[PDB]
Design a protein around this ligand. Structure first.
Ligand SMILES: [Zn+2]
Ligand SMILES: [Zn+2]
Lengths: 260, 309, 297, 255
């Protein structure tokens, strides 16, 4: 009857989509964490009805006149129903207000162009002005090369807003999701006050293939997994998705500014 | 990189003309004066891919080549106080016309054996952390910082991932963002993506006219977009990675001309042009306080990008 | 069975009433009159409670946090965030290991430089958010290894000393195990310092001092006594702020009770710092350490 | 009148050796430099003013024979204690200085050393002077027990205040620099300098070898090794010491 089932990419076990979604897209057979779409992620971590979307309508331009770019974007928009690869806004969890940004790797692999950079900057700046904590879910599998140097500069653009937010004494939780690679990994994803990730998520600057080729050796299986990054001191915690909401709620409570 | 001696494809006219004037009266020198004309024409009308090749020359001058011509009493300082002194990232302290400054940059290596020692100017996370330590020193003592970007990219290795390549670069971006001293960067080689930007979060950014600055290598883009690595040339032209392109987008503040034929033809002359640019740029920042200097950098990066509301 | 408990082993054998009552008397006598070397052996017990033993009884909603953002998450140094009676706090300390397999995992509570750098990162987080910091000292010393030296053991400790010196939040340390020299002080630069009555604090191990001064490591006992490494000694010197009693027999006899005593001491010490501003808290720590030492002008 | 090089066994005149700043003419081995000679080598003639020259050690733990051991080292070295402190100038630039001397109780740090170091540092802070500290320590001052341990914290609070005032601290690690001194002020200069082959570290070669059950490299813990592992800004041959210090001081001269 189609759509009603989902096959696990890792263990190949078939599951009711409904039941899988109720398990926050964790395969109940092998515990593989399947991608969660931006709105479902926001739903999982917020009080019902508390989400206000920011800059929902912003759309990409073609500043380099890169051939076929705006056409590739339109297709991703039709396929995912998103405007661009990030959803931003404010929400509450157990009554505590926070700014949020969730990247969706379905859209142009979650590669960061001007729109993602500007939307992330606007919610971070809003959180600075309103003294709110900020939570970013990274998901990026390459660079937005159609915007060339302008894409690279988004690493710097988002960093200046982030550091100003940090200097105001406010909390940034970086929530790295599968995959987090390249410029995103080497910018906002790696500088949370607290860095959290999910089991087996792949995180790194360069890809497995490029590294194996450069060093002429075979990388271990666990190479660049969240577990590996935790072992190497780069994550505060690896969080099974079933503890995600509770974990975020506790961190927000610890950091809640005596206020109002 | 391009081994010393072998001629570039865009030089063919010059080598063609060379033989004939060597298969010689009034005419021979007709060719001699024509060769000179053709040399100036070719090197005054360089194409994006021609510039890329010039940037990738083995003999392209390096950071340690320029420093002695620009700064006085330069003292190289080593280490990240954490793990290792990275050969690919150098730094130190010196004077720029009597004013104490800190200088940092990727060091590519002058010859083949040196390339291996310098890891081709491809830094490990210890390299970025060393750069940060020296910049924090600069900040403490209120010294301006000059950075030399010269890298095909941060090193993509196993140990570099283990020791937090991504983190070392990301931390540099946020800490450079709020530095309370002026920071002036110049791309003298290739501007390899995040590895370049890791010492590139500056108040002013300069590029040598034949240097590049790209989010990805032309070969990488060509393999990904067209699935054919051999289309690097079009990838490069389509991404717009030349100095004049970057300036057109308002992302850098000035393009520094190189001697005819490329920076390697006259290091001293090149250095004096760099030095002149450093002095100008630093002067333009003189009236800014410690907080204003940081805010200036904030506005610079915050306003980069184009989108449709 | 320790050495000093042999009387009770002899008495308990001529039982397997008068003797029963004597044995109880003799137990209380021995454990109310402990000698320096007896305390040292109690501190070194495998079952000496660890930092992770005490935390659940003292703090609420404790969340362990990992890594130095630099090299490795050191198993010998733990930390995280939680609540002390509803007040957000950061807690850090050396983690010994509850059994044998655990001892190897925790490297016996002997930290590598990455452990110190992780402690520092967590303390800077506490400072940013204005949280008090509680540290648990429990180490025979920083790890004397090859890799530890390569990764800057000395530097990682030395950096913690100067960064802790000017921290703008209250820092309260407690020695719950051995207090092994620089490796203990590396998380010990605090506004107030506490010690369990059977814990130690020494510039060098008794064995080390014995081998160096008398060329005989079997004189550890005399070395311990001559150096004056017991909680009550350190308090007499004005170097720690208070000694916390242990249950009869030692902390391991009643973890819950021990923890409640620690919690109470934390509250009292933190409270003594309540009126101080961010700058004053740092100055308070400055005066504390600046004024330690005796000399003739 | 003669000195034999501990490494190459070459015999030299003491006077010529000293004029060569105690660097062996034959094998380049850097021989220990005593406190006042170190100070002479890095300052303008007649610019040194000694601080707290007469401070002496007490016996707060009533440790047996302690004060007798001190007296002997005093008689042998002519020092009151294992550090000499004060102010000086180099090429007209004023600085505070502390030079540890490992001849005196191995340069192990007790209360006197901690107090003398803090006094010069604090002086530098109040007068906005840079500060240079030559470390030399081969063990713990165990006779003062916990009080000597605390000297690591004592010197650090002064040092961090000096640093927070925006002032320069040059840590000049000399042979040997181990234990608590290595794990405190010696490792946290704005700039860390050392000398060829100096041994620097937290724990000794013997204890580390026994702990790990393996043979350590010949260069393990040498200044050259620490430079490779990111812990020193520069290894400096004594022939360049005076000029390197002059240059660093000039770079950091305020306004
Ligand atoms: Zn599955
Ligand atoms: Zn010799």
């Amino acid at each position: 009857p189609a759509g009603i089932m989902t096959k696990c990419p890792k263990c190949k076990k078939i599951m009711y989509t409904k039941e899988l979604a109720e398990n926050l897209n964790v395969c109940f057979n092998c515990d593989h964490h399947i991608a969660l779409t931006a709105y479902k992620r926001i739903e999982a971590i917020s009080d019902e009805g508390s989400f206000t979307e920011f800059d929902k309508g912003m759309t990409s331009a073609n500043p380099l006149d890169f051939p076929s770019y705006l056409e590739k974007i339109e297709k991703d928009q039709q396929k995912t129903g998103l405007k661009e690869a990030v959803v931003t806004g404010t929400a509450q969890l157990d009554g505590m207000k926070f700014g949020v940004a969730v990247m969706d790797s379905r859209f142009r692999m979650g590669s960061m162009g001007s729109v993602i950079g500007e939307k992330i900057c606007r919610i971070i700046d809003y959180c600075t002005e309103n003294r709110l904590p900020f939570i970013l879910f990274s998901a990026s599998g390459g660079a937005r090369m159609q915007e060339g140097i302008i894409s690279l500069m988004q690493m710097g653009k988002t960093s200046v807003s982030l550091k100003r937010h940090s200097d105001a004494g406010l909390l940034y939780i970086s929530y790295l999701t599968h995959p987090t690679t390249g410029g995103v990994s080497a910018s906002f994803a790696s500088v949370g006050d607290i860095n959290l990730s999910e089991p087996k998520a792949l995180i790194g600057f360069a890809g497995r293939r490029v590294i194996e080729q450069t060093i002429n050796e075979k990388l271990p299986d666990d190479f660049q997994t969240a577990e590996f990054l935790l072992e190497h001191g780069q994550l505060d915690k690896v969080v099974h998705r079933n503890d995600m909401r509770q974990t975020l709620s506790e961190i927000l409570k610890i950091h809640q500014e005596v206020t109002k | 990189l391009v081994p010393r001696g072998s001629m570039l494809d865009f030089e063919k006219p010059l080598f063609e003309i060379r033989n004939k004037i060597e298969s010689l009266q009034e005419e021979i020198d007709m060719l001699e004066a024509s060769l000179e004309r053709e040399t100036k024409k070719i090197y005054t009308n360089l194409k994006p891919w021609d510039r890329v090749q010039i940037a990738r020359l083995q003999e392209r001058p390096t950071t340690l080549d320029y420093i002695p011509y620009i700064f006085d009493s330069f003292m190289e300082l080593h280490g990240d106080r954490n793990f290792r002194d990275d050969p690919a990232m150098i730094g130190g302290i010196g004077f720029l016309n009597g004013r104490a400054v800190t200088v940092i940059g990727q060091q590519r290596g002058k010859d083949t054996k040196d390339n291996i020692y310098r890891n081709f100017g491809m830094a490990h996370p210890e390299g970025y952390r060393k750069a940060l330590r020296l910049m924090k020193q600069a900040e403490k003592f209120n010294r301006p910082i000059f950075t030399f970007i010269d890298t095909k990219g941060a090193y993509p290795g196993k140990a570099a991932e283990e020791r937090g390549q991504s983190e070392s670069i990301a931390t540099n971006l946020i800490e450079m963002a709020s530095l309370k001293v002026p920071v002036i960067a110049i791309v003298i080689g290739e501007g390899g993506s995040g590895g370049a930007l890791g010492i590139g979060i500056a108040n002013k950014v300069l590029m040598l006219e034949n240097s590049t600055y790209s989010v990805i290598s032309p070969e990488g883009a060509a393999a990904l977009l067209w699935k054919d690595s051999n289309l690097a040339k079009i990838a490069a032209e389509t991404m717009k990675i030349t100095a004049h392109d970057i300036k057109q987008l308002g992302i850098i503040d000035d393009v520094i001309s190189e001697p005819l034929g490329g920076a390697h033809k006259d290091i001293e002359q090149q250095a004096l042009a760099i030095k002149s640019a450093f002095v100008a740029q630093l002067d333009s920042l003189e009236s800014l306080s410690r907080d204003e200097i940081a805010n200036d950098r904030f506005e610079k990066f915050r306003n980069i990008g184009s989108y449709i509301e």
